[PDB]
Amino acid sequence: GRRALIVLAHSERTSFNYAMKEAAAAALKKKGWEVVESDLYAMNFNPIISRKDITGKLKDPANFQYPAESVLAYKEGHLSPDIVAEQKKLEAADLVIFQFPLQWFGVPAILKGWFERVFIGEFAYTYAAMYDKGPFRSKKAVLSITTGGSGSMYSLQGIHGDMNVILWPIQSGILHFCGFQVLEPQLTYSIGHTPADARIQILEGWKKRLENIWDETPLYFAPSSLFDLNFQAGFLMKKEVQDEEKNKKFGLSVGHHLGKSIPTDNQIKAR
Amino acid sequence: GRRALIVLAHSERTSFNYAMKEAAAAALKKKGWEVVESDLYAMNFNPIISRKDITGKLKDPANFQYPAESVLAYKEGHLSPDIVAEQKKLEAADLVIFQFPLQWFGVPAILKGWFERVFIGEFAYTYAAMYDKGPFRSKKAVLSITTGGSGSMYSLQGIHGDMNVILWPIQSGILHFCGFQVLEPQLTYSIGHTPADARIQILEGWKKRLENIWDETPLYFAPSSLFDLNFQAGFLMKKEVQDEEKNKKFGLSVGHHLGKSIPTDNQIKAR
Amino acid sequence: GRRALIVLAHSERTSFNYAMKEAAAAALKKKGWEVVESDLYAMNFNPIISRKDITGKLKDPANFQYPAESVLAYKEGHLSPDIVAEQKKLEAADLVIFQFPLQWFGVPAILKGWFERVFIGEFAYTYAAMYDKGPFRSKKAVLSITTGGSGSMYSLQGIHGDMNVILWPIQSGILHFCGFQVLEPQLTYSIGHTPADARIQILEGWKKRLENIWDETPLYFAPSSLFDLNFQAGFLMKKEVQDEEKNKKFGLSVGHHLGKSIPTDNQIKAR
Amino acid sequence: GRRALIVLAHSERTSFNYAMKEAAAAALKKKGWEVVESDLYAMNFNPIISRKDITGKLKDPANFQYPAESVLAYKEGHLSPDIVAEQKKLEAADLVIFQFPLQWFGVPAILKGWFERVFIGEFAYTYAAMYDKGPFRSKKAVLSITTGGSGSMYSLQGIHGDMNVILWPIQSGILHFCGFQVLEPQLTYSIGHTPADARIQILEGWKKRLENIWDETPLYFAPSSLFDLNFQAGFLMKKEVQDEEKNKKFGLSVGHHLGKSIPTDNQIKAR
């Protein structure tokens, strides 16, 4: 039996977001997963990084640098207990589900702050091993997002522009950076305009997906092996890769578009 | 004299971010601007949306919906005073500078939550008048960002991928959505690896830019006039525009890439 | 007609507390009172004092002192609007009824916070005119309290001890301090164990009382004229009063027991 | 090594209250205590009881009864996580210090609400084991209170009346009810008028006390063995105890004064 962590970022128990969290928990438990939750609002989770995250002696309190100081605290065991509790959930989890409403084309502040306080250096990432070599490479993450705006608004021709671009900084920059394999997002568009019977179907479809979630093909990101991962090389794509790619019509991903066509639904559908 | 608002999102007065805020304030005042600040950490700004943003009876406490409830509060004059104070700063400002360290490929949680609590419907945006028709269309906004990662890491061939994609959800989805003209971002890369003398030069360059900031050409976003802005049309680009654009090599912008090449530095450099 | 304010502190419209509020309103209106309500839960009332209660420029933001700063805000008209609205209800009211369940031997937190945010200096009390000389001396206040525990538990020989002691800090320290004449409390004991027919009678008895509430004799507190109200005298009782009281068997009141027998039911029954 | 919880109820880090919290923490740690904090303002602690405190299915949602429903949630494991986190601190702690300014003759609303949400039935009290038989009987609690008013104002002859009466509902009704042994309160009077050198001495004296706090004799309350602890007997003092007491000049405590002289400083000094 595998272990799941569901991180929910919605204040209301009456919300569709809460219903999706409940559906996920029920489906995963039915298949013998252990399911742990971080209901950030119900926890009254503190989302602001500060010196109070470090309970031990600071290396340099006169010139406080959160990255270096937090890493030290992580290694020496003097992170704030609330952070440690979340890190333990993450360490235990095979699968991490993030359930949230899209807010200002991104994650809610309370969830952004959870990443900032919880994804501490060494624990969640290291430059020595960015992206596919990162600490969470044995784990899978998935975004389950609800929106006010319709799917069409986020189509290539839609007023808001391509959802693939919106997803990229979260899926690549936060989740994949730390090593996660990122599964296809569950995208629930214009949930405020969805009829009751269709909402029931959304919940059922999500539970169905979760029955086999671990076997899905993850989204495609450019492997780190394509890059020279040192400062002399500027962390740039290897010359021989650049030469090879010059004859290809499509770029590799949203962020690695290389000035060419982005492969369709790079951040929404696996190859 | 014009009026500037500088929103800072950094806890440390000793930081480079704070120095950039101070430099901006000094340069703008030298040119006769009135300068107001929102130092979110110094203000102990509350970044989490909740029912306590409404300082009275809720319309529907059994099914609390923040968008509708906040708009009602805005209209009836029942928003939390801390929010009202920030809205008044915004109303007064011609230019809004956001000074922050890049955190997890986006704005700090405290700044994300400032957007969430302060950019209330009717006040900051409406569906009836999205994007270039929005309330802030007579104002200009600029991001001033510091990063840990080098510029090369965020180049087209860099391990992180294109900075233009990272900037898009903030510049288009938050700032431009509300009407702002968005100026070229001030991008200060790998500030933790920059020698002392060069840091002094960064401060000087920012002050110099600010001397003439109001004359700059803003970034290019697709005008809303290219779209049919109603639910029946799905907020899609007009057919005649779609036909015309098939002859252009580059998409309109990062989000409106249309499955083609993204115009280079669309979110970094003006035409 | 006189004017009544009923302040209710209970979340449930289905509660006996809510029934008592409804009964009070109906009885007072029948006798030609104007009745205004502060249903704190239904108002979504914020019960926590903070600097956000003051919307104008603080005297000293570096050393924030709530008493001095709130008084300034009161005088200059820059208290938070929710507070101002409550203050206006109070100014209008002749009679103020507090309807609440006893919680942890006192008022519910939401009502405690209402006192803290609403009973601002100069408005509700002044050191220059404490107690019977205070701003609300033309008003009358009454507590209507429901309890889980039986009356016997709160008798002199009861496990919880004397209810007169429990009532003292509220009736003397909050209500009388501000000038109110305090009427006998309506004490509804063990309301969870009261049979249906008796509860109907409780509602009827409360309405009956309210028909003539304004004519009742208030509770006895020691008049301020018994004290030397200045720092040099330590706000101590006048010596000639002290001398006189040495020949009285009972202390003056619960708080002014003087190391003697407390007059029976000092905080429950008028002389 | 024993465990301490310090619960602070003050918004300002610049406050004397905050300094007393810091002093307590430093002194206890120096003597090898483990010290945990609940800085209620810094936590943005939610102080209002409601149905949202119960995350599971309610027994009777049509007639919501907080006592019964919260106890069920406690037993079934579906109390709100923020409450559970506080309960875990309490469970761990040997000593609990409450540091707060006196506000309207009691605890700040935010602290009152902490008691209301955290001291759930079965966890913190039960009828079957009130007072000296309660769940926290192996723990010790102490109030550390600052006041605006001078000590003389709270003397027997003082305008405010006896501080022992003010303390009783908190120390007996909240702390002792749950089983705590209650230590002598640290009473810091008129802290706004105290000279600089004396304030330094207050901090030092508090630290000194804390060095040996565990060895102090607690305050005297009437033992529950003096009472018949069942509904039929009305939780009244036993007849044989009543007979024995009849010839004694002094009552037993503030609340059990029995119509006679209150033993001096019953809630301030151990006997």
Ligand SMILES: Cc1cc2nc3c(=O)[nH]c(=O)nc-3n(C[C@H](O)[C@H](O)[C@H](O)COP(=O)(O)OP(=O)(O)OC[C@H]3O[C@@H](n4cnc5c(N)ncnc54)[C@H](O)[C@@H]3O)c2cc1C
């Ligand atoms: C600050 C802010 C910024 C925003 N920015 C954006 C943005 O950038 N882009 C965008 O597109 N949107 C945006 N939104 C809108 C937001 O994404 C949506 O409001 C949100 O996704 C709605 O999800 P919900 O769970 O709150 O829905 P709700 O409105 O709470 O619920 C939807 C419906 O599902 C029902 N429901 C609940 N439980 C069940 C159940 N068990 N079974 C069936 N039905 C059930 C509810 O009763 C309701 O009818 C923003 C909103 C806010 C507040």
Ligand SMILES: Cc1cc2nc3c(=O)[nH]c(=O)nc-3n(C[C@H](O)[C@H](O)[C@H](O)COP(=O)(O)OP(=O)(O)OC[C@H]3O[C@@H](n4cnc5c(N)ncnc54)[C@H](O)[C@@H]3O)c2cc1C
């Ligand atoms: C949670 C988190 C997430 C992050 N995510 C990302 C990410 O996604 N991408 C990324 O690239 N980076 C990321 N970073 C790194 C972050 O962007 C940098 O640490 C930040 O930009 C550094 O700016 P600062 O103001 O803190 O500089 P500081 O480190 O405070 O200052 C840098 C230097 O400037 C000096 N200085 C200060 N004042 C002056 C002055 N007046 N004149 C000259 N020199 C001065 C300082 O002494 C120091 O030498 C993240 C950091 C955090 C904490």
Ligand SMILES: Cc1cc2nc3c(=O)[nH]c(=O)nc-3n(C[C@H](O)[C@H](O)[C@H](O)COP(=O)(O)OP(=O)(O)OC[C@H]3O[C@@H](n4cnc5c(N)ncnc54)[C@H](O)[C@@H]3O)c2cc1C
């Ligand atoms: C956090 C907390 C702390 C507490 N601390 C204390 C304490 O220190 N001391 C103490 O003694 N108690 C204490 N209690 C108990 C509390 O005081 C009682 O539960 C409360 O007073 C009950 O009043 P209610 O309005 O909720 O009654 P309810 O239980 O809501 O109603 C009482 C009865 O009246 C019925 N009813 C409702 N409306 C009507 C109507 N119109 N006509 C007739 N019947 C009606 C209901 O069905 C029910 O049978 C505490 C409770 C809480 C939650």
Ligand SMILES: Cc1cc2nc3c(=O)[nH]c(=O)nc-3n(C[C@H](O)[C@H](O)[C@H](O)COP(=O)(O)OP(=O)(O)OC[C@H]3O[C@@H](n4cnc5c(N)ncnc54)[C@H](O)[C@@H]3O)c2cc1C
């Ligand atoms: C709503 C409300 C109701 C109130 N009701 C009552 C009431 O019923 N009865 C009553 O008596 N009072 C009452 N007060 C007054 C209140 O009890 C006092 O204002 C409070 O106790 C003062 O404590 P503080 O920590 O706020 O002190 P501060 O004013 O913050 O500090 C007091 C002094 O200590 C100094 N100090 C700070 N840190 C240190 C340090 N490290 N070392 C040395 N000195 C230091 C400060 O600079 C200042 O000079 C009420 C206040 C409010 C806001």
